[PDB]
Every structure is written in structure tokens, then in C-alpha cells.
Amino acid sequence: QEFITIGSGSTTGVYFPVATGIAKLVNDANVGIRANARSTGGSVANINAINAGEFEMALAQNDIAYYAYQGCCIPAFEGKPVKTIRALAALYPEVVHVVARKDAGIRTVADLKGKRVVVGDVGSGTEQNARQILEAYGLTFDDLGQAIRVSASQGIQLMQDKRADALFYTVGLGASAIQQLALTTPIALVAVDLNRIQAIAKKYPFYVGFNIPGGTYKGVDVTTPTVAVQAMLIASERLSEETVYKFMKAVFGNLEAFKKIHPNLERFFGLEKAVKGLPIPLHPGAERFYKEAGVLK
Ligand SMILES: N[C@@H](CCC(=O)O)C(=O)O
């Protein structure tokens, strides 16, 4: 068998269940691939691991993938393009969640000054968005009381224990980590003003407005106006066309099966959307798949 490891994120985010379900589905297709998901810090770690030859595929944010491919915009990639990544599919929106304890004196992003904040994991996309958003509100990590980098499960535990005041997570709606925190702890979601971000859209062009419906998380009954990017499935350029083509048919050829993997896929995924506005080139095997499917002409 040909072994594929799919980098993901924290076990209580959305990448990890999605990657796990993708891996199972391609294994079940009996196409000579043996796939597994791996938990990681998220997008930056995942791209680095593809480039290093450690992972064959991963989930990543569209913004981070662009920055990697261009060698720009964030410190992790500035100065050295990562041209070894290719797109397979745009998947679903990843929303910037800014979670605050209700007792912490936080109603806006500006209130994070002096607070203990989980800014994202080491190697996360989340941290990059947090840094950009804080600067749009006139803050740096140094203005925080503590800038904490940990996994989603560690981060929610800190907020449960009142060892953190707030937590950022760029993640699909309905992440277990967030759901679990809302069940135990009085929390709110802090708004992120797109227009304040928009002042920085020249530099960071992938933010879109996104409104988290009220009642998504327990006790959070009001809507939350924030911003989103897009989750993507990416792959090494070094994977053969034939391997990627077979993978694509096994995973995306099976649309009902694919959408069962996570509610975000059922809600948001579609084949036409999968190829729209991509930040990096498609893998040849994906191009072939989408051409046959009639999605690319
Ligand atoms: N987009 C997040 C991870 C989201 C998830 O694990 O679902 C990141 O790159 O850090």
C-alpha cells in the first residue's frame, strides 16, 4: 500500500475529525492507499510538514496556504516560498471565535489588553489571525497579560479553571472544544469588526464577514458578528497524479459519504465551491477529477 498521513489540528477541533473521516473513507475504497490522520498544531505546522516530506496531505486555511506559497505576509514563511503544496478542495468556512469568560472584563477585542489569552496553538493558523486582528484593534501580544499557545483541549481547560480569560480559535462552527467549554463555563463570543480588518485587506485578502448564529454554543444566544477564512485540503506536489486522482474519486466521488464526515461538510461543501477562489494551484490529480466531474471545463 501507499501510505498517506493527513495533518490536521487539535483532536477537539474540526480538522481532526474531518481528516480522520477522510482517511477512513479512502481506506474503505480499497484503492491501494492506507491513510491516517495526525493531530498537530494546525495550518503552519501542517504546511511545514508537507514541505519537509513528513506528511503527504493536510488541512490548512486558505490564507495560510497563500502566504506559504508566496513566501510572504506571516513570519513563518516570509522570504522563502513553499511551492511544494497543491490544493485538493476548498471545504467549509473557518470562523474566528474569540471566546471570553463572562467574569473577565472583556466585551470587545480592545478589552483583551492585560488579560490572559490563548492566542492559538504553536504552528496554528489561529495565532496568525489573532495577531492580525489584535493589531487592527491597536494591540500586540505584548499588550496581553499573557499570550498562551496551547492545544484546543488545553486551552479550554485553562478557561474552565480561570487560568485564562479568553481564547482565539479559527475553526469551523461546532468544534467540540468550544461546545464542551460552553457546557461547563459562562462564556461569551466577542465580535470582530470586518471594517477594522478591512483597513488591512490589502495585506490580508481572505477575510470575509461571518455571523455565528445565536444558539450555536450553549448560553451564547445572541449572534456573533466576526470574520472567516476557508478550510482547504492540500497535498504534496510530490504525490503522483494517479494516486491523487484515485484518492479524489474515493473521497469526493462519494459525496453522500463525504458529507457524513462532519456537519460543516453537510452544511457548506459542494463540488463547484471546492474549486472557487483557490489560493494555490490544484494538484494534477485533482484537476483531472474535477474536469471529469464537469466542475472544471
Ligand atoms: N484553522 C486552524 C485549525 C482548525 C481546526 O483544527 O479545525 C489552524 O490552522 O490552526
Topology summary:
Elements (H helix, E strand, L loop, with lengths): L1 E6 L7 H14 L4 E6 L4 H10 L4 E5 H9 L14 E17 L14 E5 L4 H12 L9 E4 L2 H9 L5 E6 L4 H9 L2 E3 L4 H5 L9 E5 L11 E13 L4 H12 L2 H5 L3 H6 L2 H4 L9 H10 L4
Parallel strand pairs: 1-2, 1-3, 5-6, 5-7
Antiparallel strand pairs: 3-10, 4-7, 4-8, 4-10, 9-10
Pfam families: NMT1_3
Organism: Thermus thermophilus (strain ATCC 27634 / DSM 579 / HB8)
Protein name: Immunogenic protein
Question: How would you describe this protein?
Answer:
By secondary structure, the chain is of the alpha/beta class. The chain folds into two domains: 2-91 and 232-293, Periplasmic binding protein-like II (D-Maltodextrin-Binding Protein, domain 2), CATH 3.40.190; 94-229, Periplasmic binding protein-like II (D-Maltodextrin-Binding Protein, domain 2), CATH 3.40.190.10. It is 35% helix and 24% strand. Strands 1, 2, 3, 4, 5, 6, 7, 8, 9 and 10 form a ten-stranded mixed sheet that branches. Helix 5 runs parallel beside helix 6. The longest helix has 14 residues, at 15-28. The protein binds glutamic acid. Disulfide bonds join 72-73. L-glutamate binds at residues 14-15, 43, 94, 125-126, 170.
User: Could you say which structural class the secondary elements and strand pairing correspond to?
Assistant: alpha/beta
| Helix proportion range | 25-40%
Task: Determine Rg (CA atoms, Å).
Answer: 19 Å
Biggest sheet, in brief? 10 strands, mixed
The percentage of residues in β strands lies in 15-25%
Q: CATH first level of the largest domain: which class?
A: Alpha Beta
CATH topology of the largest domain: D-Maltodextrin-Binding Protein, domain 2
* Small-molecule components bound: glutamic acid
CATH-defined architecture of the largest domain = 3-Layer(aba) Sandwich
The total beta strand count reads 10
The helix-strand sequence is EHEHEHEEHEHEHEHEEHHHHH
Question: Which superfamily, in CATH terms, is the homologous superfamily of the largest domain?
Answer: Periplasmic binding protein-like II
Shape: globular
The domain count comes to 2
Spatial separation of the terminal alpha carbons: 33 Å
In DSSP terms (H or I, runs of 4 or more residues), the helix count works out at 12
Organism: Thermus thermophilus (strain ATCC 27634 / DSM 579 / HB8)
InterPro entries: TRAP_TAXI
Pfam families: NMT1_3
Protein name: Immunogenic protein
